Amino acid sequence: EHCNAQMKTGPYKIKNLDITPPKETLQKDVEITIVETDYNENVIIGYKGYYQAYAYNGGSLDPNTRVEETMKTLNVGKEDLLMWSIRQQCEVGEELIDRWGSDSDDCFRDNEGRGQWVKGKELVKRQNNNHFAHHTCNKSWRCGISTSKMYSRLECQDDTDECQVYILDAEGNPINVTVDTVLHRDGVSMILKQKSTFTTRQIKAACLLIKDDKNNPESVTREHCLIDNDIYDLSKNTWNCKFNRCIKRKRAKYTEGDTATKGDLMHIQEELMYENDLLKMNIELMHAHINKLNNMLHDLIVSVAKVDERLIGNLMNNSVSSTFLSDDTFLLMPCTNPPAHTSNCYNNSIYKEGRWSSQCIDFSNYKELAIDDDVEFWIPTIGNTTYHDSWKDASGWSFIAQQKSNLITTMENTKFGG
Amino acid sequence: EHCNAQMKTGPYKIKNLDITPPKETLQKDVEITIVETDYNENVIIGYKGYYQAYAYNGGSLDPNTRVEETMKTLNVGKEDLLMWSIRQQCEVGEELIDRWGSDSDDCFRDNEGRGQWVKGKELVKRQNNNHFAHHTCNKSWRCGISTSKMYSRLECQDDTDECQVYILDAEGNPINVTVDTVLHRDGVSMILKQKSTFTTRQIKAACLLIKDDKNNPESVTREHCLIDNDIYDLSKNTWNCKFNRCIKRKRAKYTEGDTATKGDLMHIQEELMYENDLLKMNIELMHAHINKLNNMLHDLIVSVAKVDERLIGNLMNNSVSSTFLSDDTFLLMPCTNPPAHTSNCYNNSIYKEGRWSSQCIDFSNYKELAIDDDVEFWIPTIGNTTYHDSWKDASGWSFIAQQKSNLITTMENTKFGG
Amino acid sequence: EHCNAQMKTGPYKIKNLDITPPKETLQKDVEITIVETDYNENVIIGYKGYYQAYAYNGGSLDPNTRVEETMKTLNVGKEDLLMWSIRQQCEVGEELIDRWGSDSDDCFRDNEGRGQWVKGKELVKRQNNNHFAHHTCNKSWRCGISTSKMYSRLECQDDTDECQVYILDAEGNPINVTVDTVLHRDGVSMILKQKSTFTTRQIKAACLLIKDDKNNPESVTREHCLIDNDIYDLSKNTWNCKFNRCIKRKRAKYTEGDTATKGDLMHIQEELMYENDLLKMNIELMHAHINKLNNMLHDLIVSVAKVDERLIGNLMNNSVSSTFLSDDTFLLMPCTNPPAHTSNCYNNSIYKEGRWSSQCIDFSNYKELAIDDDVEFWIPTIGNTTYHDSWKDASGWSFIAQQKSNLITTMENTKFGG
Ligand SMILES: [Hg+2]
Ligand SMILES: [Hg+2]
Ligand SMILES: [Hg+2]
Ligand SMILES: [Hg+2]
Ligand SMILES: [Hg+2]
Ligand SMILES: [Hg+2]
Ligand SMILES: [Hg+2]
Ligand SMILES: [Hg+2]
Ligand SMILES: [Hg+2]
Ligand SMILES: [Hg+2]
Ligand SMILES: [Hg+2]
Ligand SMILES: [Hg+2]
Ligand SMILES: [Hg+2]
Ligand SMILES: [Hg+2]
Ligand SMILES: [Hg+2]
């Protein structure tokens, strides 16, 4: 307290800190529509066919000495296909081995394939022509039935809010498979067991809103919403559709079920690493600030303690009286007091410090004065996630792949039907 | 205030809190080089071949009675391959069915395959030998052309900062496919439409730096950098290369495009769950600390309010005067004041409290005194990510797979060419 | 200070803020058992077979004029299979081309395949019957050996804490492949080079514990544990097993190695986006609160500065004296003081302010009074992650796929063995 008076600077006033209105807003009870189908649908897959070798032996002289070979693949019709499913069995015609002479014609009798009921059956590539001056016939049948699964994809229109369940091939393209008409594709016959069925559900959900477009401080740049402890982006108010589900705030190749790459995982991993280090930086940046503030509160204490001998005791929550030596340093002595002071008189005529009989009140029943707000933080439990299969994993498509492969193998091992 | 004097402890001084210099540093304007190619490159894929059955019938007696079968796969040359691409068509020779007698030799006339232009064509495995004392020839042609895509992989050397675009097979290995020479592989002929072209881009980017090696408190253990609202690790100052892009702060199997596993997803999911719970713990740990501090500030208030009757009013931002009963408890009365006091005199001779005519100043124009720093938090918008296809999804490789399969099927259905 | 006395409200007391006991607890030195096997195991894969065409030519008259074709696939036995591995070679019988007449019987001599040692070998589908009144024999051999890899899966029982290493097929099912018995599957013979071996490791690890079930405030709803700078969920105290490793706090299709989808990646991406915006909201929500608190500390300052002229100087850490004009506004003058005051006397009789020779102490050696706690934040380094291959990538299964394909191709190109 010895100062140059000829240098008074001012007038001054303490700069209060900016209280910024939050750009991220929590909105409760946001109305949301969920539309969902079965992950996969039951598809009846059936195939049929025969390999035939009709031959005639007139010796080397005859131009009619030949072995005509055919491998017909047949379609299976709606009613048969259904029957096949019900029965977990498929129907073929009779196996004709070495039917020669006048029996050469058993071959042309049945081209639908009737009378044999098997679990399944594969061709045998049988052929012979060792009956001189005669025709020889061999005709082997193949057969297969499966009620397999194929992946659904739900889709809804923002125009009309109408939805449809698409059935996808191994590559993510929808395919025309219906309940009323058999589809013939990849050498096979396909029909739906069930008309594809969906369902809607209405909810009120908690959404985090973000308004960080400086030009449009009211435009909502991102919205994250809690659907059953799982987070979703619903910023765009178009229908949001993936796999078997569609969500909204009240035909080309689909792509979500494509196989993901290790490389994109690793980037998500780096993003996670980043988030962790981002958490640490900001937490510590906040830590440091508070500590600075804490220390200001210290400078406050030492100053006001020179007048208030019992303050340090209060702060430490233990009754002790302080005696200062400098502004900086001080001493402590133990104390304990009669705490039952509930009125403010005894035989009163301005008695105690800070100056303490209607001007004489008992304060047993008093109320808390709220001069502060507590902050409340919103960090809900998350992580109820679903994993979906890639589109190349459909049980139905591998079934189709299997019979295709089985045919390839049997049709290259020639058999003698004698 | 009744204390044991014989127990003075000290001298004491209030322990200030450690202000830790931040280990995570933000560095602005970090110079960065981006090198990028097309995700995929256009590859002309062409294939050709014939199946031939040259037979002679001299009866069972003749050892020369035989059916010689061959299936040649041919190479397609640079110029033809280009022509094929331009024309979306491929060229084959004439289809020879049942050419016997003196026409047996049509077979050997054309082995290049000229004169027929088709969109594409598959073999027919035709054969016969029913012309006694004569040779019989059948020769069927196959044909295919596609200008498909195959995935690029960029690579740069830290030595010399030279880059190259590699074209990968379905397994992630580079393959020698050039603009000047046709590559013959997997029974097919391949050439590039275009010389592989890249491009560079220089940027200044914001990077988060981390120095958490206790032994080397200056070594930078991790660096995360913002490239167009997407986060990258550039701690190592080697070239960072994935898929079609390379980044740097100014031949074996590649691996990023391998298919990722559900299991590694789930771990990333658990890491996310962890981060969320890590956020909650630390936020609340900070919450609690501040509340403790807030309550200290309360003990301060009650003490200094015994001298300052208008303080509580100021804090609550409403004019009220306080009267204390104990140290703890107090009463309130309403007030409102004339706020236009801009000088500090009236007819002044030490008038108001705290003691308030050159010693008499008007303070209309005053300045804010900055005794505090605001903290500033760095949490930029992220999430502009790219997804890449797995290496088994290249349109070009499935084309090659397709023709391979088509050949397999046709070469096991024998036809009679009579 | 002019107030309506007829409206005293009270008695009041300042509401302290709730200090909430943390629901997320850090527990150190949690005992954990790790069990681990090799990622993959060495599997000896061997295959063998022949294609035979035994024919007889008695002319068109003879019913015995026929070409009997067979393609046997053989099993390879334990000892041979081992020998094959050691030698990187496989054994076949002699190639018989056009052995006719009395040599027709070379065909039936050797059906095991002995005497030829090759790196590998493929069939040639050779056949002829151009020797009148004689049998003709052709028999070609195929051969293949690989010591390939197949993926391990570790599994442990909570009952008995016994573990086993399973060897998986391309679809994630375990297969019965042992050291003592050859397995015959997919037209091939398989045996283990090595008995499958695991190993255990005990650690003490730091775990984050969470108790957020309101009904059971002691139940531990989630536990995240650090295993070598990588985070794991060990809430459930069952064995946790994925791929080749099992962890615990002291046969159907396995699924972790299935291919993950782009769609599930994108959701993880949205979760990350969410976390970032969640970090920002909460950080800023905390920022705002502190600033409010900071400003309270300002109202405190101005009040107590009216009594303490040197306080503002202390806070700003520079010696200056304050003179007030209103309650709000003030002026500053420069100062600097003799700081060596280490006793509290000179020629003392109640000298300085706040009232400052055994009642006369030197304070060179004083101690810091801890009236505060620093908070300590726990954000450990993470991100030592492992990536695993999908189950369709096993070198051993593609080897099996390869020979299968090679056979398909050779068995549809007929050759004349004359
Ligand atoms: Hg005939
Ligand atoms: Hg006969
Ligand atoms: Hg006859
Ligand atoms: Hg990414
Ligand atoms: Hg009293
Ligand atoms: Hg000839
Ligand atoms: Hg003829
Ligand atoms: Hg002739
Ligand atoms: Hg991971
Ligand atoms: Hg006044
Ligand atoms: Hg015979
Ligand atoms: Hg002969
Ligand atoms: Hg002979
Ligand atoms: Hg997800
Ligand atoms: Hg002094």
Neighboring chain B residues of C242 at a CB cutoff of 8 Å? 263, 266-267
The answer to whether position C97 is within a domain reads: yes
Residues flanking ion ligand 9, Cβ below 5 Å: B 267; C 385
The answer to whether position A52 is within a domain reads: yes
- Collapse the DSSP code of B403 into the 3-class scheme (helix H, G, I; strand E, B; otherwise coil) and give the result: helix
* Beta-sheet strand order (sheet of B330-334): A367-369, C9-14, B330-334, B320-324
Tell me how far apart the alpha carbons of residues A48 and A182 are, in angstroms, rounded to a whole number.
Answer: 14
Tell me how far apart the alpha carbons of residues C278 and A379 are, in angstroms, rounded to a whole number.
Answer: 8
Tell me how far apart the alpha carbons of residues C154 and C36 are, in angstroms, rounded to a whole number.
Answer: 7
- C270 and C240 both lie in a single domain: no
Question: Are C172 and C258 contacting, i.e. CB atoms less than 8 angstroms apart?
Answer: yes
Other C-beta atoms closer than 10 Å to the C-beta of B110 total 16
Task: Say which of C18, C131, C388 has its CB closest to residue B261.
Answer: C388
Question: Are A130 and C63 contacting, i.e. CB atoms less than 8 angstroms apart?
Answer: yes
Counting Cα atoms < 13 Å in the Cβ hemisphere of B233 gives 19
- C145 and C64 both lie in a single domain: yes
Tell me how far apart the alpha carbons of residues C334 and C320 are, in angstroms, rounded to a whole number.
Answer: 5
Task: Say which of C65, C333, C337 has its CB closest to residue A4.
Answer: C333
Tell me how far apart the alpha carbons of residues C239 and C244 are, in angstroms, rounded to a whole number.
Answer: 13
Cα–Cα distances (Å) from B154 to A304, B179, B199, B240, C168, in that order, read 68, 17, 11, 10, 35
Task: Say which of A4, A293, A418 has its CB closest to residue C294.
Answer: A293
CA of C129 to the centre of ligand 7 (A): 22
Other C-beta atoms closer than 10 Å to the C-beta of B108 total 11
Establish if B233 touches chain C: CB-CB under 8 angstroms: no
Backbone φ/ψ region at C133: left (φ over 0), alpha (ψ -120 to 50), beta: left
- Collapse the DSSP code of A70 into the 3-class scheme (helix H, G, I; strand E, B; otherwise coil) and give the result: strand
Residue type, B210: I
User: Is C293 close to B295, i.e. CB distance below 8 A?
Assistant: no
Burial-class residue A127 by CB neighbours within 10 Å (0-12, 13-18, 19+). Answer: buried
- C59 and C144 both lie in a single domain: yes
Phi, psi for C325 (deg, rounded to 5): -115, -50
Neighboring chain C residues of B337 at a CB cutoff of 8 Å? 2
Touching chains, B (3+ CB pairs < 8 A): A, C
DSSP string, C50-69: EEEEEEEE-TTT-TT-EEEE
| HEC readout, C280-349 | HHHHHHHHHHHHHHHHHHHHHHHHHHCCCCCHHHHHCCCCEEEEECCCCCEEEEECCCCCCCCCCCCCCC
Tell me how far apart the alpha carbons of residues B188 and B180 are, in angstroms, rounded to a whole number.
Answer: 17
Question: Are A147 and A108 contacting, i.e. CB atoms less than 8 angstroms apart?
Answer: no
- C344 and C330 both lie in a single domain: no
Positive or negative, the CA dihedral A183, A188, A194, A200 is: negative
- C52 and C126 both lie in a single domain: yes
**Chain A nearest C-alpha distance from C87 (Å):** 31
Question: Are A346 and B37 contacting, i.e. CB atoms less than 8 angstroms apart?
Answer: no
Other C-beta atoms closer than 10 Å to the C-beta of A174 total 17
**Chain A nearest C-alpha distance from C418 (Å):** 20
Tell me how far apart the alpha carbons of residues B158 and B249 are, in angstroms, rounded to a whole number.
Answer: 11
Burial-class residue B157 by CB neighbours within 10 Å (0-12, 13-18, 19+). Answer: exposed
Burial-class residue B289 by CB neighbours within 10 Å (0-12, 13-18, 19+). Answer: buried
Chain B and chain C share a number of CB contacts under 8 A equal to 289
User: Is B17 close to A294, i.e. CB distance below 8 A?
Assistant: yes
The answer to whether position A41 is within a domain reads: no
The answer to whether position B13 is within a domain reads: no
Positive or negative, the CA dihedral C69, C75, C80, C82 is: positive
Neighboring chain A residues of C363 at a CB cutoff of 8 Å? 325-326, 329
Burial-class residue C340 by CB neighbours within 10 Å (0-12, 13-18, 19+). Answer: exposed
Instruction: Give me B269's structure tokens.
Output: 């999911």
- Collapse the DSSP code of A141 into the 3-class scheme (helix H, G, I; strand E, B; otherwise coil) and give the result: strand
Other C-beta atoms closer than 10 Å to the C-beta of A365 total 7
B283 beta partners = none
Establish if A259 touches chain B: CB-CB under 8 angstroms: yes
- C99 and C180 both lie in a single domain: yes
Residue type, A243: F
B115 beta partners = none
Question: Are A145 and A84 contacting, i.e. CB atoms less than 8 angstroms apart?
Answer: yes
- A187 and A268 both lie in a single domain: no
Chain gaps in chain B, named by the residue before each (C–N > 2.5 Å): 250, 356
- Collapse the DSSP code of B97 into the 3-class scheme (helix H, G, I; strand E, B; otherwise coil) and give the result: strand
Cα–Cα distances (Å) from B143 to A328, B50, B73, B112, B416, in that order, read 97, 9, 10, 12, 22
CA of A387 to the centre of ligand 14 (A): 7
Tell me how far apart the alpha carbons of residues C118 and C116 are, in angstroms, rounded to a whole number.
Answer: 6
Q: Which of B140, B134, B121, B132 is nearest to B70 (CA)?
A: B140
**Residues in chain B, overall count:** 418
**Chain A nearest C-alpha distance from B83 (Å):** 31
Chain center to CA of B63: 68
User: Is B408 close to C413, i.e. CB distance below 8 A?
Assistant: no
Cα–Cα distances (Å) from B322 to A40, A369, B352, in that order, read 72, 12, 19
Question: Are A235 and A213 contacting, i.e. CB atoms less than 8 angstroms apart?
Answer: no
Burial-class residue C174 by CB neighbours within 10 Å (0-12, 13-18, 19+). Answer: middle
Tell me how far apart the alpha carbons of residues A49 and A408 are, in angstroms, rounded to a whole number.
Answer: 13
Instruction: Give me B68's structure tokens.
Output: 């010689």
A241 beta partners = A246
Tell me how far apart the alpha carbons of residues C49 and C111 are, in angstroms, rounded to a whole number.
Answer: 9
Alpha carbon dihedral C208, C214, C215, C221, in 10-degree steps, equals -20
Question: Are C327 and B310 contacting, i.e. CB atoms less than 8 angstroms apart?
Answer: yes
- A241 and A265 both lie in a single domain: no
The answer to whether position C168 is within a domain reads: yes
Query: What is the DSSP code (8-state) at residue A78?
Result: H
Question: Are C57 and B313 contacting, i.e. CB atoms less than 8 angstroms apart?
Answer: no
CA of A63 to the centre of ligand 11 (A): 27
Q: Resolution of the experimental model in angstroms, please?
A: 3.0
Other C-beta atoms closer than 10 Å to the C-beta of C197 total 10
Other C-beta atoms closer than 10 Å to the C-beta of C315 total 19
Instruction: Give me B295's structure tokens.
Output: 């309550």
Count of domains for chain B: 5
> In sequence order, what are the residues at sequence separation of 6 or more whose Cβ sits closer than 8 angstroms to the Cβ of residue B410?
B122, B123, B124, B125, B142
Query: What is the DSSP code (8-state) at residue B59?
Result: T
Tell me how far apart the alpha carbons of residues B295 and B299 are, in angstroms, rounded to a whole number.
Answer: 7
Q: Which of A35, A39, B274 is nearest to C261 (CA)?
A: A39
Tell me how far apart the alpha carbons of residues B180 and B320 are, in angstroms, rounded to a whole number.
Answer: 91
Tell me how far apart the alpha carbons of residues A348 and B325 are, in angstroms, rounded to a whole number.
Answer: 13
Q: Which of A284, C377, A24, C287 is nearest to B376 (CA)?
A: C287
State which residue of chain C sits closest to A370, comparing Cα positions. Answer: C15
Element (H, E) at C240: strand C240-242
Tell me how far apart the alpha carbons of residues B296 and A222 are, in angstroms, rounded to a whole number.
Answer: 39
Instruction: Give me A353's structure tokens.
Output: 């410090």
**Surface of B (88-147) touching A: CB under 8 A:** 128, 130-132
DSSP string, A190-227: EEESS---EEEEEEEEEEEEE---SS-TTS--EEEEES
Q: Which of C52, C122, C405 is nearest to A408 (CA)?
A: C405
DSSP string, A223-282: EEEESSS-EEE--S-S-EEETTEEEEE------TTSBPBHHHHHHHHHHHHHHHHHHHHH
Instruction: Give me C416's structure tokens.
Output: 């004349």
> In sequence order, what are the residues at sequence separation of 6 or more whose Cβ sits closer than 8 angstroms to the Cβ of residue B108?
none
**Chain C nearest C-alpha distance from A375 (Å):** 7
- Collapse the DSSP code of B3 into the 3-class scheme (helix H, G, I; strand E, B; otherwise coil) and give the result: coil
Residue type, B282: N
Q: Which of A219, A230, A223 is nearest to A207 (CA)?
A: A223
User: Is C377 close to A232, i.e. CB distance below 8 A?
Assistant: no
Other C-beta atoms closer than 10 Å to the C-beta of A355 total 10
Instruction: Give me B309's structure tokens.
Output: 């009757």
Q: Which of B126, B72, B121, B67 is nearest to B92 (CA)?
A: B121
- Collapse the DSSP code of B21 into the 3-class scheme (helix H, G, I; strand E, B; otherwise coil) and give the result: coil
Other C-beta atoms closer than 10 Å to the C-beta of C360 total 11
In sequence order, which ranges of C369-410 are alpha helices (DSSP H)?
Answer: 395-410
User: Is C275 close to B274, i.e. CB distance below 8 A?
Assistant: no
A12 beta partners = B367, C330
Task: Say which of C224, C259, C409 has its CB closest to residue B259.
Answer: C259
| Final residue of a structural domain among A283, A317, A337 | A337
Q: Which of A100, A97, A110, A104 is nearest to A139 (CA)?
A: A97
Question: Are C153 and C244 contacting, i.e. CB atoms less than 8 angstroms apart?
Answer: yes
Chain A and chain B share a number of CB contacts under 8 A equal to 289
> In sequence order, what are the residues at sequence separation of 6 or more whose Cβ sits closer than 8 angstroms to the Cβ of residue B405?
none
CA of B409 to the centre of ligand 1 (A): 29
The answer to whether position C33 is within a domain reads: no
Give the ligand at the shortest distance from the Cα of C104.
11
**Chain A nearest C-alpha distance from B369 (Å):** 5
Tell me how far apart the alpha carbons of residues C393 and A2 are, in angstroms, rounded to a whole number.
Answer: 84
CATH number at residue C408: 6.10.250.2130
Tell me how far apart the alpha carbons of residues B387 and B395 are, in angstroms, rounded to a whole number.
Answer: 17
Beta-strand pair B40-57/B66-74? antiparallel
Question: Are A128 and C66 contacting, i.e. CB atoms less than 8 angstroms apart?
Answer: yes
- B89 and B52 both lie in a single domain: yes
> In sequence order, what are the residues at sequence separation of 6 or more whose Cβ sits closer than 8 angstroms to the Cβ of residue A392?
A170, A171, A259, C259
Establish if B389 touches chain A: CB-CB under 8 angstroms: yes
Counting Cα atoms < 13 Å in the Cβ hemisphere of C133 gives 1
Other C-beta atoms closer than 10 Å to the C-beta of B83 total 17
Other C-beta atoms closer than 10 Å to the C-beta of B20 total 11
Establish if B359 touches chain A: CB-CB under 8 angstroms: no
Q: Which of C397, C185, A272, A350 is nearest to B264 (CA)?
A: A272
Beta-strand pair C414-416/B231-233? unpaired
CA of C328 to the centre of ligand 10 (A): 13
Burial-class residue A316 by CB neighbours within 10 Å (0-12, 13-18, 19+). Answer: middle
C271 beta partners = none
Instruction: Give me B126's structure tokens.
Output: 């035709």
Tell me how far apart the alpha carbons of residues C177 and C37 are, in angstroms, rounded to a whole number.
Answer: 16
Task: Say which of B265, B297, B329 has its CB closest to residue A297.
Answer: B297
Establish if C318 touches chain A: CB-CB under 8 angstroms: no
- Collapse the DSSP code of B227 into the 3-class scheme (helix H, G, I; strand E, B; otherwise coil) and give the result: coil
Helical packing angle, C262-305 and B262-305, nearest 10°: 10
Positive or negative, the CA dihedral C339, C343, C348, C351 is: positive
Residue type, A28: K
User: Is C387 close to A265, i.e. CB distance below 8 A?
Assistant: yes
Tell me how far apart the alpha carbons of residues A382 and A278 are, in angstroms, rounded to a whole number.
Answer: 20
Tell me how far apart the alpha carbons of residues B257 and B241 are, in angstroms, rounded to a whole number.
Answer: 12
Tell me how far apart the alpha carbons of residues C325 and A100 are, in angstroms, rounded to a whole number.
Answer: 128
Question: Are B92 and B48 contacting, i.e. CB atoms less than 8 angstroms apart?
Answer: yes
Tell me how far apart the alpha carbons of residues A72 and A407 are, in angstroms, rounded to a whole number.
Answer: 12
Q: Could you give the angle at the alpha carbon of A49 between the alpha carbons of A45 and A50, nearest 5°?
A: 160
Residue type, A176: N
Cα–Cα distances (Å) from B353 to B7, C324, C356, in that order, read 39, 10, 26
> In sequence order, what are the residues at sequence separation of 6 or more whose Cβ sits closer than 8 angstroms to the Cβ of residue C204?
C28, C29, C30, C31, C32
Counting Cα atoms < 13 Å in the Cβ hemisphere of A341 gives 15
Domain that holds residue C415: 371-418
**Chain A nearest C-alpha distance from C245 (Å):** 20
The answer to whether position B31 is within a domain reads: no
Tell me how far apart the alpha carbons of residues B238 and B247 are, in angstroms, rounded to a whole number.
Answer: 9
Query: Tokens 């713990």 identify what position?
Result: B281
**Chain A nearest C-alpha distance from C27 (Å):** 20
- A60 and A184 both lie in a single domain: yes
The answer to whether position C128 is within a domain reads: yes
The set of long-range contacts for B351-356, using a CB threshold of 8 Å and a minimum separation of 24, is B353/C306, B354/C306, B354/C307, B354/C324, B354/C327, B356/C324, B356/C325, B356/C326
Question: Are B169 and B185 contacting, i.e. CB atoms less than 8 angstroms apart?
Answer: no
C44 beta partners = C147, C191
Tell me how far apart the alpha carbons of residues B272 and B294 are, in angstroms, rounded to a whole number.
Answer: 32
State which residue of chain A sits closest to B128, comparing Cα positions. Answer: A66
CA of C163 to the centre of ligand 8 (A): 79
Other C-beta atoms closer than 10 Å to the C-beta of A331 total 18
Tell me how far apart the alpha carbons of residues B265 and C27 are, in angstroms, rounded to a whole number.
Answer: 27
> In sequence order, what are the residues at sequence separation of 6 or more whose Cβ sits closer than 8 angstroms to the Cβ of residue B355?
none
State which residue of chain B sits closest to A271, comparing Cα positions. Answer: B231
Element (H, E) at B183: strand B183-185
In sequence order, which ranges of B190-346 are alpha helices (DSSP H)?
Answer: 262-305, 311-315
Q: Could you give the angle at the alpha carbon of B167 between the alpha carbons of B164 and B173, nearest 5°?
A: 105
- B153 and B233 both lie in a single domain: no
Tell me how far apart the alpha carbons of residues C352 and C357 are, in angstroms, rounded to a whole number.
Answer: 16
Neighboring chain B residues of C321 at a CB cutoff of 8 Å? none
Instruction: Give me C274's structure tokens.
Output: 């969410």
Alpha carbon dihedral B29, B30, B33, B37, in 10-degree steps, equals -70
Phi, psi for C244 (deg, rounded to 5): -105, 5
- B151 and B175 both lie in a single domain: yes
Tell me how far apart the alpha carbons of residues C196 and A280 are, in angstroms, rounded to a whole number.
Answer: 43
B30 beta partners = B205
Cα–Cα distances (Å) from B227 to C198, C258, C338, in that order, read 44, 32, 55
CA of C109 to the centre of ligand 11 (A): 17
> In sequence order, what are the residues at sequence separation of 6 or more whose Cβ sits closer than 8 angstroms to the Cβ of residue C398?
none
Other C-beta atoms closer than 10 Å to the C-beta of A234 total 19
CA of A63 to the centre of ligand 12 (A): 25
Question: Are B50 and B141 contacting, i.e. CB atoms less than 8 angstroms apart?
Answer: yes
Counting Cα atoms < 13 Å in the Cβ hemisphere of C218 gives 0
Establish if B401 touches chain C: CB-CB under 8 angstroms: no
Element (H, E) at B76: none
Residue type, A301: I
Tell me how far apart the alpha carbons of residues A168 and A185 are, in angstroms, rounded to a whole number.
Answer: 13
